[PDB]
Design a protein around this ligand. Structure first.
Ligand SMILES: O=C(Nc1cncc2c1CCCC2)[C@@H]1CNS(=O)(=O)c2ccc(Cl)cc21
Ligand SMILES: [Cl-]
Lengths: 305, 305
């Protein structure tokens, strides 16, 4: 029993964190094989951030302008190239602690663990979700740039995020490991803001199925709904539209509990209408949206209580 | 910016997790140097759990009765002894990945990270607090026994918890690494329940100081209070009494924000009486008590390991 927001063990990623310095800027890098990946704004000053010409700033740099430090050892840089918003530094030593890895681009609603680092040194790990507006509600201070997001399924680390910036509202934006930003963000100090955020509906439903598995049924009702009628209500509460793909993905949880997806949608419709009335679901007074249907199956038992 | 429940990087602990099997029982062990530490109930059957004479069960066992598996390699057991409720298995091989460590007993209110394991294989990491009633609200399924709790201080891992059992309310009980239980619990199938729990007041105040640092000030007021008057109100909402030690420990957060501890106590007094009124603090509708004053400082400063 028990339901916690759980991050993946950070060990396979800890052995990849290095410190990258270019002149006066110091952020984190990810050392995989003989390549170190870090944000391309490491080559930028605070004046350069308003309108940076990265191709023009990179052409003026040589390998020895980048200092890479893995623990107490200096790695020699023997090449440099740019791929979108990430800088790829070819180093002379292959990382002996390189795990089995993949670079994956995630979609809004997907969750991941973040290993927050400062000066190539990991300081903490936490779980979070890619928001529908493409931002992440993370915990990042100055110097955390280059901290990475990941999932570890089986013996494979799937890198899905690299931290690049903080928006004016305190939320965070960054790229996949190929340097492509999530959302309409640029690595430029411009007037950009996060779009209106919506609740990840398929994740709230998954968390309601997890509550039923842990013996919580107070929120269930004798009602059902059409998929269309549910969406007309949910969107009035800034909930993300629920697609037929979402209903299909919730299939195994519906079968395990014996509560049809549209029957759980009627419980959510009523929860939005009435609130909790002093009650909690899995120790929470709010409706949780950072657990995917796949996370619920991973953490929760196969036997319902 | 950002405030997340953050666990320590689990890497130094991951390299210590082994699988311990005795007959039909399979749980986790902690391999430090040439000793493997695991719950002593690994030597127990389901009939033995009712009234187990552990000295009598252990005298009937030989070294080869315990199978220890580190990754895909079998460790040969060459000795066995008991220390309170933990079994110490002397192995032939010293762990090459043994970190700098200490065994420490924590006090209720102190927090720690848990690396949840099944079959000597880590599957997740999460942060939690030792409740005032000595239980932990964790996330554990069958096979989790022997999962350990820890903090990191520089390069030193401080082991403070080993999981033993789940209580009928879904909460968890376990021992320090010397086999001494946290709470009035015993390692056996018997009628035991968690006592009435209280809110860790010094931790709620620390989390209110973290909200002010992140730009949340709606709960602040012009009022102050005496330590005695605050404790009379706290005693009514099942909150831990606040001592002068707690006030002293909150000193640095009081200086950083410019809000005296008794001024923050007047704000908490008003949240306990009148509620939140549709508002949230750091994205929460409940008052959070699993962040110590040190955790607030470490997360809002960037302390690396
Ligand atoms: O956003 C940025 N840094 C940063 C990253 N993570 C966490 C935190 C910060 C700043 C302090 C607070 C915590 C920088 C500088 N500020 S900026 O607006 O010039 C900017 C813009 C784009 C890019 Cl890609 C980068 C940046
Ligand atoms: Cl995805």
């Amino acid at each position: 029993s028990g339901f916690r927001k759980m991050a993946f063990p950070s060990g396979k990623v800890e052995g990849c964190m290095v410190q990258v310095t270019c002149g006066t800027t110091t952020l984190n890098g990810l050392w995989l094989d003989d390549v170190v990946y870090c944000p391309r704004h490491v080559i930028c000053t605070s004046e350069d951030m308003l309108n940076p010409n990265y191709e023009d700033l990179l052409i003026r740099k040589s390998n020895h302008n980048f200092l890479v430090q893995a623990g107490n050892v200096q790695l020699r840089v023997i090449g440099h190239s740019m791929q979108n918003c990430v800088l790829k530094l070819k180093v002379d030593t292959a990382n002996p602690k390189t795990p089995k890895y993949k670079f994956v681009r995630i979609q809004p609603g997907q969750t991941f663990s973040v290993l927050a680092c400062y000066n190539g040194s990991p300081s903490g790990v936490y779980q979070c979700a890619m928001r529908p507006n493409f931002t992440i509600k993370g915990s990042f201070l100055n110097g955390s740039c280059g901290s990475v997001g990941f999932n570890i399924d089986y013996d494979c680390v799937s890198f899905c995020y690299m931290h690049h910036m903080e928006l004016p509202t305190g939320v965070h934006a960054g790229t996949d490991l190929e340097g492509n930003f999530y959302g309409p963000f640029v690595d430029r100090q411009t007037a950009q803001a996060a779009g209106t955020d919506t609740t990840i509906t398929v994740n709230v439903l998954a968390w309601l199925y997890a509550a039923v598995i842990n013996g919580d049924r107070w929120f269930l009702n004798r009602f059902t709904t059409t998929l269309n009628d549910f969406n007309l209500v949910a969107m009035k509460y800034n909930y993300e539209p629920l697609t037929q793909d979402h209903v299909d993905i919730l299939g195994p949880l519906s079968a395990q509990t014996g509560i049809a997806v549209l029957d759980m949608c009627a419980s959510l419709k009523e929860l939005l209408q009435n609130g909790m009335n002093g009650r909690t679901i899995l120790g929470s007074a709010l409706l949780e949206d950072e657990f995917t249907p796949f996370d619920v199956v991973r953490q929760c038992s196969g036997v319902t209580f």
